[PDB]
């Protein structure tokens, strides 16, 4: 069948610029009626896709005017005029001249912000947590930019790796900052012969690591 | 205007028949329209899968082989899917939509549900409250929480307040663990406001059929 190569944008854009996605074919879509056949999709975190162009240049109904299509039979270009921080995601192109009409592995839309400082927040386990067995320990980190960011924990002062699971969120449409939450988890008897529990987070906003803390 | 959604068990053990129902509305399915079946695999590779129009023409893709069947009712204008011998490799989210000769389907695209095949067992989830172990400087913004572990499959739906409260709300993307999910999610709200003015939130846990609300209180 048809192979459809998406590229990977090489860096966040600035807000209010000219954005390009790429997406191209090993056959044309062209077809015998002159039309081209090549859909456009957005899809935003936690939502289905969204038609944004489809014949390849036609915007599809309630569609920002900042958004258009161009291209061959087998090269196509989607324009997003003024980029704004509501446009991250992931953009997917779809052929639709012959079964099975296939999809675009995607293409995932940054946005350059101004570099924020994570909000840390720790919390210990809860009286209901622990009268199960088990104790987690939870930190999150909010509202940072860039996504790049490392969090270490210690007990007692001492590095630990084992037990510790991350999950970051993707970016915010609204103010386009990410956020992440790492959880300590351990067993009750552990939790009970420890006294000290550190989260340490080393962003680029700053030499020193923002470290939160508490004691059993 | 028009509306999908998909309804269906969101857990099928291997081997086992897969069937999925989408319901619409404000538009009749007995028309010349493409209604297809799409879904979206972990990594989220979205993939055609059939489609029946015009109630007696039925289209799939070659790859489904034949385990794959498209049939509709017109009394309560709903289409079904149904996919014979699913694996673990069938695990993912299923969206309904409409399609049209040009390939435009507009706003016509259902919540999508997902699908997890798999043997394990479901299990609800157990909810615990993320407070502040102690004080620091208010007249600021204070962060709480809910931890919510152990739970298959996905997914769960987190509110806070029963969803009068929706700004200031980070929820996490679910990690698993010995074959069982668990999620955090934060909320920041006005220290001048808790914990008089109290906050909960609220977990839904579809497939086992239950909903937890936790208060969250001083320790
Ligand atoms: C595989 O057949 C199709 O995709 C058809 C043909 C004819 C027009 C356009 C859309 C149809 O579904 N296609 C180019």
């Known amino acids: 069948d048809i192979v459809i190569t998406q590229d990977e944008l090489s860096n966040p854009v600035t807000s209010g610029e000219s954005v390009s996605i790429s997406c191209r074919s090993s056959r044309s879509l062209l077809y015998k009626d002159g039309r081209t056949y090549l859909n456009w999709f957005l899809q935003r975190p936690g939502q289905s896709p969204q038609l944004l162009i489809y014949l390849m240049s036609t915007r599809a109904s309630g569609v920002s005017d900042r958004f258009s299509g161009s291209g061959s039979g087998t090269d196509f270009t989607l324009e997003i005029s003024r980029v704004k921080a509501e446009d991250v995601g992931v953009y997917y192109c779809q052929q639709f001249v012959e079964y099975p009409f296939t999809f675009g592995s995607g293409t995932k839309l940054e946005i350059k912000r101004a570099d924020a400082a994570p909000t840390v927040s720790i919390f210990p386990p809860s009286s209901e947590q622990l009268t199960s067995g088990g104790a987690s320990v939870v930190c999150f980190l909010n509202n940072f930019y860039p996504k790049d960011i490392n969090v270490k924990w210690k007990i007692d002062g001492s590095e630990r790796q084992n037990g510790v699971l991350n999950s970051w969120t993707d970016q915010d449409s609204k103010d386009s900052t990410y956020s992440m939450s790492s959880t300590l988890t351990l067993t009750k008897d552990e939790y009970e012969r420890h006294n000290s529990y550190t989260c340490e987070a080393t962003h680029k906003t700053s030499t020193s690591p923002i470290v939160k803390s508490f004691n059993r | 205007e028009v509306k999908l959604s998909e309804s269906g068990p969101g857990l099928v053990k291997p081997s086992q028949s897969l069937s999925l129902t989408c319901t619409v509305t404000?538009?009749?399915?007995?028309?010349?329209?493409?209604w297809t079946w799409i879904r979206q695999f972990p990594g989220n590779k979205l993939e055609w899968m059939g489609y029946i129009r015009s109630s007696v023409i039925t289209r799939y893709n070659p790859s489904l082989k034949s385990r794959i069947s498209i049939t509709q009712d017109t009394s309560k204008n709903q289409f079904f899917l149904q996919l014979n011998s699913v694996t673990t490799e069938d695990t993912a989210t299923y969206y309904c939509?409409?399609?049209?000769?040009?390939?435009?389907?507009?706003?016509?695209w259902g919540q999508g549900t997902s699908v997890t095949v798999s043997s394990a067992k479901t299990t609800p989830p157990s909810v615990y409250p993320l407070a502040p172990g102690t004080a620091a400087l208010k007249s600021s913004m204070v962060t709480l929480g809910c931890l919510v572990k152990g739970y298959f499959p996905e997914p769960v739906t987190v509110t806070w307040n029963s969803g009068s409260l929706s700004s200031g709300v980070h929820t996490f993307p679910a990690v698993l663990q010995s074959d069982l999910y668990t999620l955090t999610s934060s909320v920041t709200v006005p220290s001048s406001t808790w914990p008089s003015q109290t906050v909960t939130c609220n977990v839904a846990h579809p497939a086992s059929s239950t909903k937890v609300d936790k208060k969250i209180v001083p320790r």
């Open positions: 404000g538009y009749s399915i007995t028309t010349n329209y493409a």
């Open positions: 939509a409409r399609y049209d000769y040009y390939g435009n389907t507009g706003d016509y």
